[PDB]
Write a protein that binds this ligand. Structure first.
Ligand SMILES: OCCSc1nc2ccccc2[nH]1
Ligand SMILES: OCCSc1nc2ccccc2[nH]1
Lengths: 546, 546
């Protein structure tokens, strides 16, 4: 029966409320009780505050009208306002102190995933203060989680006028009895109640959530921690840059601040960073998540030598040049992590900082060919299977749904053994034809990868493995160098191929290397433990890349 | 006969040279003459500096080897180095002091436009210092003006080894007698001379340029000021964002720093900002030059009401939301300038600062319909001609080459009279069928606009003029507001329609408005006086938007 939930901003989704700060200001300045709240409401429907909430005047135009109201009120109360009394200073601190009420936002997100239409209906103003960016940032964070945002100053109506409630019902396409309305001001609930809406008076968050659980029948309060917010491909800004006549790179972009370039591995997509992109943008970075060469919407030339590290790194430098970026932080995973270590070794002036997930920095051995080293370790035997052009492509392209469902699994759900791949004559020889869906991915997420690989196939991606001698010869030029720019190595306890032990001598080459370690995490780090990855990257970026 | 010019970086394209700073450091610290230059070259081909220039070691690995060399040299000279002696400190200041030698860069640009292949051949290092960004920025600025950049540390060879000269000739595809080689180090010219190349020893810039003019036959020294660097559409990063199911906005992006959104007018393109985009990016801004709705690669729905200001402004806010930008500086020209004033009036929290080229802020009159005001001024008569759907489209789409050649002209080259357009029954009634090319545009630039308008035509663009009453009704809501965020109004002396006098009462609405004025400038401000626009915008951005 209930299918829509409406929340107020001030005092409900953001705490503390402005009215609460006015009461504390009166106590701190030993002013008569309610003086600032009376000046704020002076004139009712014809007063300055109603004109502000309706968008007739801006916040900066209202500030001197509110100060005049404070003086008129203090005069009738027979009191004097302190010498340094400033409405602007009081409001600046009140707005600045306001943070998202995480448990209330989590309840709204939970209701939305269960099919509820969610909205914010708020009495707010046109903020033209020099510090208005703080409010714009708060609104942008909240906005993305709600179906509708209705602000009084944009529609010319305020709560508790009954027409704003009729406007809300028309916008939601719902009858009053299907709506739950949460507000901390009792007067603002009365019109919603007259129409027949379920109302909840918000004094403390926990009691309001208990009422909300009771009326919706959905558990909201003691629920497990949700996954980080993920990307909707259709809502991203897609960028395209031609780095060479036949090569165009696609990326998705979000945020402002220092540039952070994310480099996925095999056989992945920019979409493998879906849980990191909003978190890193919200932390104050401009995120560029690439489709590496050979993948998704980036060019995929068939030639093997187009995928050697020297060419790939040169194109990443050109990518920065064409975007006008003198530097970027480079973060890679798997094949992308291999590339980011070589970007730091050959172009340190373009790399602000470097981080690798799972992939260690492995220096070339000038006495041993990489093909000889492959045979010495049965862990990397499967790479010999990837050498012959056409062989692994036919197996991997045969059934795309099976390829991604078999690969994208948690460490305890594995259906593949990377040893004896050449002996068996394939990667999926003793693997089921229809594997179960892993717990880390949904069918919808799998189908995104399937659609992306339907375009250029596996030739481009597999060609990254077919330049072993070319890469070895190139890497040998850097054997006298050290990596002396900020660097982070993140190991994954349960990675089958890139084991944490392979990273143990990295300090010899990167003396001030920082480390992160994720327990119970397999190869697909980003989607296996997204919350842990986000925390590790954000803390490192804030200390070593800012 | 000569068709390639090669320049060194240090001491030729960038001044002062490092070797010059070593000599000044010796004089300032009262060290024996040549001590630092001897330590720098200690060991010759097997020394630390050659290993640095070949890319074997990085700059940070070389610093302690150079300090050890300084001590070995001071010991044989029987002198003591001062207590605070630091090679890192000396090199940091030397690199920091180095600026582009503008007259030398201007000569290279002039040779390139006359058909010369240009290259930089330099002995340089892998810079991994914490301050390496300064060098990366210098290299990016220079890079874009040259066909090739050959760095010693990337190719493993140094000047004066003869194989780096053979490598250069192979890269240029030229024989030695077709090459002019400029360098400030005499020893580095000897191998080029042995091969038969024309060499110029650079001591002072003016004398080197006189030698270069004599040998090339091209005037380089007393030439007029060149136009700012312009965009090549194929080299830009193209971005696409879906703001609504049927509406996708295209933009080009360049640079890092605070976001600056450029909004073109009618009937233009993102390409109208071609001279501002590189200048604003080089000044430290992230430029987003839009294709406004109805234009180029942005969506162009046929419905009139899709182009009213309320809808357009709402979509620009969504554009910022999808990119993760809490704020942007908005700069508009013509119809774009109209939009940016309304962005500041309705969404001040999303607008960091606002600037308009030519378009004044004109408040709505609540007593007079905009269609009545149009008839009172014969200057705006042509807007009545744009009202009837289909009429102006057929005339403007008839011959696209004629439409753009007739419109894009300097104030003294006009072939159109905007008065009596309705009386004549068309905009081009007494206009030539094949007008001459204006001096502000080339045929190639005209053809870009022709190709862009071949896609969606003039319906979308003309629909911006067909929402007069809808826009008037919407603007009436803001009559009690003032614009109190940083604002710049730039007038153009010779604009036929948007005359500077129409902006004179703007201070009543924007009390702290800043102004710019461009003399002898017509309607097409950006391409008419690009250098003047750039200077005005950059100075304003650096003081009011940073
Ligand atoms: O360090 C290079 C990538 S190692 C590697 N990553 C893989 C992911 C999936 C299957 C085989 C793989 N082999
Ligand atoms: O302020 C709205 C645009 S005024 C206007 N700009 C034009 C450019 C070209 C032709 C007619 C024009 N009319």
């Amino acid at each position: 029966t209930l299918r829509a939930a409406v929340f107020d901003l001030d005092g409900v989704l953001a705490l503390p409320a402005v009215f609460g700060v006015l009461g504390r200001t009166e106590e701190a300045l030993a002013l008569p009780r309610g003086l600032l709240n009376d000046a704020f409401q002076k004139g009712g429907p014809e007063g300055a505050t109603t004109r502000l909430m309706k968008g007739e005047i801006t916040l900066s135009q209202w500030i001197p009208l509110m100060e005049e109201n404070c003086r008129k009120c203090s005069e009738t109360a027979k009191v004097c306002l302190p010498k340094n009394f400033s409405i602007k200073e009081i409001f600046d601190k009140a707005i600045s102190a306001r943070k998202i009420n995480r448990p209330m936002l989590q309840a709204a997100l939970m209701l939305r995933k269960k099919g509820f239409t969610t909205a914010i209906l708020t009495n707010t103003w046109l903020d033209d203060r020099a510090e208005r960016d703080g409010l714009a940032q708060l609104m942008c964070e909240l906005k993305m989680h709600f179906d509708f945002l209705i602000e009084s100053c944009q529609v010319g109506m305020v709560k508790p006028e009954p027409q704003i409630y009729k406007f809300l019902l028309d916008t939601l396409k719902a009858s009053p009895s299907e709506v739950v309305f949460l507000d901390d001001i009792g007067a603002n609930l009365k019109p919603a109640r007259d129409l027949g809406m379920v109302t909840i008076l918000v004094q403390d968050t926990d009691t309001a959530l208990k009422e909300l659980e009771k009326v919706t029948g959905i558990q909201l309060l003691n629920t497990p921690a949700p996954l980080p917010t993920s990307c909707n491909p259709s809502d991203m800004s897609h960028g395209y840059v031609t780095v060479k006549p036949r090569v165009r790179l696609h990326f998705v972009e979000l945020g402002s601040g220092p540039a952070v370039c994310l480099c996925h591995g095999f056989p992945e997509s920019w979409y493998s960073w879906r849980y990191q992109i909003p978190a890193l943008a919200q932390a104050g970075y401009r995120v560029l998540a690439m489709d590496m060469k050979g993948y998704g919407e980036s060019s995929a030339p068939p030639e093997i030598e187009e995928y050697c590290m020297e060419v790939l790194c040169k194109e990443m430098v050109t990518f920065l040049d064409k975007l006008g970026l003198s530097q970027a932080v480079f973060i890679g995973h798997d094949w992308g992590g291999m590339l980011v270590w070589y970007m730091a070794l050959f172009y340190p002036e373009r790399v602000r900082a470097v981080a690798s997930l799972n992939t260690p920095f492995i220096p070339a051995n000038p006495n041993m060919s990489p093909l000889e080293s492959i045979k010495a370790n049965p862990v990397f035997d499967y790479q010999l299977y990837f050498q012959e052009p056409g062989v692994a492509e036919a197996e991997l392209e045969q059934n795309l749904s099976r390829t991604f469902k078999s690969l994208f699994r948690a460490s305890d759900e594995s259906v593949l053994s990377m040893h004896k791949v050449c002996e068996a004559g394939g990667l999926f020889v003793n693997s089921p034809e229809e594997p179960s869906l892993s717990r880390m991915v949904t069918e919808e997420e799998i189908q995104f990868y399937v659609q992306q690989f339907k375009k250029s196939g596996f030739r481009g991606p597999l060609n990254w493995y077919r330049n072993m001698e070319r890469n070895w010869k190139w890497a040998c030029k850097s054997l006298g160098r050290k990596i002396l720019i900020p660097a982070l190595m993140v190991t994954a306890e349960k990675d089958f191929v890139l084991v944490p032990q392979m990273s143990q001598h990295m300090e010899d080459w990167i003396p001030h290397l920082k480390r992160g370690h994720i327990e119970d995490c397999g190869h697909w780090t980003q989607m296996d433990k997204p919350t842990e990855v986000n925390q590790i990257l954000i803390k490192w970026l804030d200390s070593d890349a800012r």
